[PDB]
Amino acid sequence: KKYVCVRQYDLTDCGAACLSSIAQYYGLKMSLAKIREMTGTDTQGTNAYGLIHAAKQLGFSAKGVKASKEDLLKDFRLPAIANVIVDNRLAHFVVIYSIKNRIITVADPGKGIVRYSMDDFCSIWTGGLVLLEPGEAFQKGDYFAGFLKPLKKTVLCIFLASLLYTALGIAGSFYIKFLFDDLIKFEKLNDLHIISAGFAVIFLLQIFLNYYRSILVTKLGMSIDKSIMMEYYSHVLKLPMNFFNSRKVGEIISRFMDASKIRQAISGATLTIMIDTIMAVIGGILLYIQNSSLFFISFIIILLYGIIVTVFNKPIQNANRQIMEDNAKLTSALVESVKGIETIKSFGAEEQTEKSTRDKIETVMKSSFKEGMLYINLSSLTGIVAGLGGIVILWAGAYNVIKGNMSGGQLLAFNALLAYFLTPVKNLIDLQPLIQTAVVASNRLGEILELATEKELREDSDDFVISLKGDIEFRNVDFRYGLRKPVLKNINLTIPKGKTVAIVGESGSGKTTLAKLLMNFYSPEKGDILINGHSIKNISLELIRKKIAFVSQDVFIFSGTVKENLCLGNENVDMDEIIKAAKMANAHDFIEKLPLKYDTFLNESGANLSEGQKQRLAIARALLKKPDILILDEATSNLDSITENHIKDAIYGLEDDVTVIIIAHRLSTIVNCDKIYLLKDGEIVESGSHTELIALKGCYFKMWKQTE
Amino acid sequence: KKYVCVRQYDLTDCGAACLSSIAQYYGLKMSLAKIREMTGTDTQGTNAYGLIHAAKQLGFSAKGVKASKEDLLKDFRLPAIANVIVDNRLAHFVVIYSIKNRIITVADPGKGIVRYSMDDFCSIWTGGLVLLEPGEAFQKGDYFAGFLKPLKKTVLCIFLASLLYTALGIAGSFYIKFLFDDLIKFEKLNDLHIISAGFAVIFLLQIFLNYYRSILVTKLGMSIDKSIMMEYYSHVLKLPMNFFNSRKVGEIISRFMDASKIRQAISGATLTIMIDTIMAVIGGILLYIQNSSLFFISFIIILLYGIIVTVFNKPIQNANRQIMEDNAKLTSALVESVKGIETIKSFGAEEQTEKSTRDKIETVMKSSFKEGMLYINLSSLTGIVAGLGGIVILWAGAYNVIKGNMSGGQLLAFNALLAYFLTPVKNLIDLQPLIQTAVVASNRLGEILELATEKELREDSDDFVISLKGDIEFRNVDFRYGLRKPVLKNINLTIPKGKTVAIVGESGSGKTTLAKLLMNFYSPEKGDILINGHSIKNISLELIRKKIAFVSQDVFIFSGTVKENLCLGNENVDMDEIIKAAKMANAHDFIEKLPLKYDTFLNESGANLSEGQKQRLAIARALLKKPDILILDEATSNLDSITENHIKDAIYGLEDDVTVIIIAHRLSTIVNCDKIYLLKDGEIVESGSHTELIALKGCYFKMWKQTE
Ligand SMILES: Nc1ncnc2c1ncn2[C@@H]1O[C@H](COP(=O)(O)OP(=O)(O)OP(=O)(O)O)[C@@H](O)[C@H]1O
Ligand SMILES: Nc1ncnc2c1ncn2[C@@H]1O[C@H](COP(=O)(O)OP(=O)(O)OP(=O)(O)O)[C@@H](O)[C@H]1O
């Protein structure tokens, strides 16, 4: 056996890095990004419970107990993961491989191979330990193309064009060398004119080849950009709301906009690499035929250039990864700053926002200064190396001329061959900047492959039939958001079928998350939500959100025409149906006074529309969808009595086919209804009808008396 | 005089273009951007009333009457602007300059100048005319540096470095030519080694000079980008919310990010232009000394290159302006699509939101393909011209060698001089892409140069006297948003001083714009808003927003820590005051249960906070500001019973120093208050106290009876 460890790449989430390191220690050479993302890493630091769950799903026999002071154990099972409080800063996760008698081997990825004595061990940490051992499910073993395959003919044509251009250049160089070698002391004017005409024809042929080469390179880049953009965006929509809550808007906006670099750079780099490969293949044979000493000198120069580029390849990513993830932060701050235009001016804090944006610009630009300084230094070093190589080549040519080995035509041919070889040097210089494509590909694939499980695989629906009607119910449902005490602690609730039930409660008493669970926005940990003797986990997710709607309080009016916003979702809608819906939800008398009936272009999100009017419009839009089960969180008319219509028409229009769940902020708005459900401290405290709850004389009656 | 006209650049709003054209016809060389902006151009088209208002404010004596069929008028005052219904498509605006007997000269911006008689003149249009004449308020006359001035030493150093590099190159070329001319067949090994060492030393000096020059340009571009970005953001801050309502968020975000190139290309192009100027200055003298025929050939080649680059110089902007304006629209739609992630998934319409994005990508990429095809074509013709010039130069050199005019060393010197001259050709090729910076500079001066700057221009207060606070009142206030009937028609309202007054109404009855006017968000057209015998137009705008707050219903929680959000605006706040405020607005018992007291990092806008809880937090934040005049819009805790506290503590805590305006959606929540103000159809319909209004038995009583 030998010592092996994996170092740190991220900054805040070192626990996932430690888990990956122990994974490859047991022999799982899997990408750390995907494993880290399905571990469930937190920005502020996931606790040991998430790590235990990640070990369980990986196939480990993990168990978490406070760290034993006696770290000289014998029946112990290595390696181990433990917590440390580094000089009273935070809790960091470290791994220990093999104790012998006295040496504590800690493989901290932060700063390399670490070696503390027990004096430091007793000083740093306080308590924490997870005993991870494989459960034989965690099994050992030494465990893009489609886009290239759709343009095989174009790739072949581009390669043929590059080969033709290289052949034309080689033929022209050979003809020029032969003319110089033979027709030197010729003194012929017509021959010179004919040679000039031939050279002009060769140049015209080269231009003709360059036409097709450049046009097809641009066309290939176009299609590659289209494919990658479309795939990313399609995958970026199909995510659960948890990823949206976790990340900012700008950290998503900036990732998509970075394709402009990769498309152009890859389009250029493919042609450059093909041309360089062809040129090197020709040049190697040409040099081998020509001479050995000149070939040796050229090989030495190429080896020096390759040594330089290999030595300085690593540092480029170290700057690019900072540039990208600081530009992302700049965009994320600026988007939010612009969006809250009303609030920023309302409290008159413009200069503070300006100074914050100045700080963001200053850091994003100080990073760029270094990222350009490295490029300039490398370019200058490469140019100096090229100049030294050219001086050496000139000296060698002079020595050969003095010795009489090579002739003037041979010197010209050697110069042409050296230029052809240095074309690969220019290709290597360009590929030095291909790290700019590598970093953007790795950054954006970081949520393409890792989050792929969240797209549809995590659903695991597998459902035989469709739709629902009846009654909803809960069974031992425990739901938590993470880093917080559970809000849905223990619910035993069965809503009566086809009745107007309502849920009242207090602020922070989970009045919404209860409805959020029904839409399968977040999956519950324990228990299940049953509908007509079924389960949410065993029903198609499309019908789950298609048959039941949800009128969120923060209504989001989508940009475009009114007809599109009303028709969003269920497409192919006749105008008569939406007219009936608007009359049903009081959205027809409103639309009459607008300048263009159902043809007004709404800018941004209801900018030219009143907030109460937008709330009414959202209810109308939901009533278009014809939901069987409806959920209204207050936000009904928001105009005092008028709200009588926008519900009474529904209940009268229901004809007992639908059921309604009213998350009612304002008590006494729900009096003549089937049941009232209070949940406090997670548990369903008291339930019953209005008269029954009033006669009960509990906390419900106390709150009612306090209200009035 | 002579005929002059202006061509159309936009598509939908040609009236602003016609107004600008008639402005230059009367001697106004102002950018059409600002004029088009304060004309009030709509996506569909502004009527004649807005154009008349624009003429009045610009200083043109305009009057709008239906067009006279008898268009042979003699007492008339040309030029004229008239509307036309072009073959029953839309209402376009045209200008007529001079009529002789049977001549109509339509200088249509869309299709240039056309000549028509009355044969078609009566056929096309139906009715409309505006008679614009200079009222002598308009006047005739032929109506960046700081950033360059702060880097004079750096610019001088860069110029000196470029001159040193040019001198080193010239000295090396001259030494090489002299060595070839003198030591052609000397065959001295020591002399060759010494010459190689000297050439290597010269190359090292040139490499050092290029290194220093490159780092100079990099740091100069750094500072230029910093200054320009910082300037733009501040100017994008104090702009009327009108600008925010009119424009999308992406059309603002894409402008700021556009600097990424302008900075880099300008930094490169400054050094390139300086080097090219120095090289051309040297080369002209060198060629004049050398020979005339070679100088004539070089001048002809340079003229051909200039002609070919100038012929296609204008078309590049015609593509870049499309590229930028389409990328802006892509970002504007995609940002909204991402930020409405809840609503998109609520109705499960991810399919449509992908197809629309695919269409946007397709158009923004076809435009890019065209704009790259133009670049490739121009580059290919430039390369072909360069190759032809090189062939001609080789033929001329061969002819001179045959005639015996120039020698081999002279041929090498001529080749070096030709390379130095063609360096300016490469500089011109690079400056061909400087249109990419010119277009973004123009697009962004379309905002920087052309903006309202609400602080500087719209205010015009210049208040030296201390602000006075008391009862508020309205005087003949008429306020409209544009293209709509006025919402604030005619108000004669005087709020009692230091009393709890409330304003109730119906949806679409200006239930907020009335308060929006007080904050001087939009300036009223007629009348004024008086405070303690003063006016809003004659009070400092900072105090107007510092002394009175506004709790918007769409609360915007600003990203960061809770302490920052509470302390936003009024900085330097002691913790005791915010604790008192939170206890005053019920925001302390909330903050206790959170994991970190006043130190929780909020993602996005209240993502990990309850909606209602964020609403309460906004009220607490407003109560920090200690406003003398307060405006609530329901949205007080929204928990019914608890709301009693979050107002009663304020009124008890006010001690009559403050006054409160309650825009109350829910009637019967305001019973024990000073006055109730109903505004209907713009006018104040009925006012009075609760008992007085009940005894009045009007529409107020009818609505009360209908409510319950
Ligand atoms: N991502 C999250 N989503 C929802 N609630 C969260 C989240 N993170 C933390 N929480 C907390 O969990 C609780 C759930 O609040 P919930 O959204 O259910 O309230 P609500 O229905 O808006 O309350 P109210 O009675 O004021 O109307 C709150 O205390 C909230 O601050
Ligand atoms: N920029 C704008 N600001 C406000 N209203 C606008 C604007 N543009 C158009 N409108 C329209 O003008 C009318 C004025 O509405 P206003 O904003 O005064 O109502 P509100 O007080 O917000 O409404 P409510 O009390 O019913 O919720 C509405 O029909 C609104 O849609």
Numbering used by the authors:
A (entry chain B), B (entry chain A): 8 to 150, 158 to 722
What does the paper say about this structure?
To obtain a structural basis for this biochemical property, wtPCAT1 was vitrified in the presence of excess substrate and ATP. Mg2+ ion was omitted to prevent ATP hydrolysis. Cryo-EM reconstruction resulted in a predominant conformation at an overall resolution of 4.5 Å. Density modification further improved the map, showing side chain densities for the dimerized NBDs as well as ligand densities that are consistent with ATP. In the presence of ATP without Mg2+, wtPCAT1 adopts an outward-facing (OF) conformation in which the NBDs form a closed dimer, and the translocation pathway opens to the extracellular space. The intracellular, lateral opening of the translocation pathway observed in the IF conformations is completely closed. The PEP domains are flexibly attached to the core transporter, with no defined interactions with the TMDs or the NBDs. No density corresponding to the substrate is observed, possibly due to the limited resolution of the PEP domains. In the absence of Mg2+, PCAT1 predominately exhibits an OF conformation, in which the PEP domains are detached from the translocation pathway, the NBDs are dimerized with two ATP molecules poised for hydrolysis, and the cargo substrate has been released. Using Eq. 2, we conclude that the energy of the OF conformation is lower than that of the IF conformation.
Peptidase-containing ABC transporters (PCATs) in gram-positive bacteria function both as maturation proteases and exporters for biofilm formation, quorum sensing, or antimicrobial polypeptides. Substrates of PCATs are synthesized as precursors with an N-terminal leader peptide. Proteolytic cleavage of the leader peptide at the conserved double-glycine motif is necessary for secretion of the cargo peptide. In this work, we determined the structures of wild-type PCAT1 (wtPCAT1) in the presence of substrate and ATP with or without Mg2+.
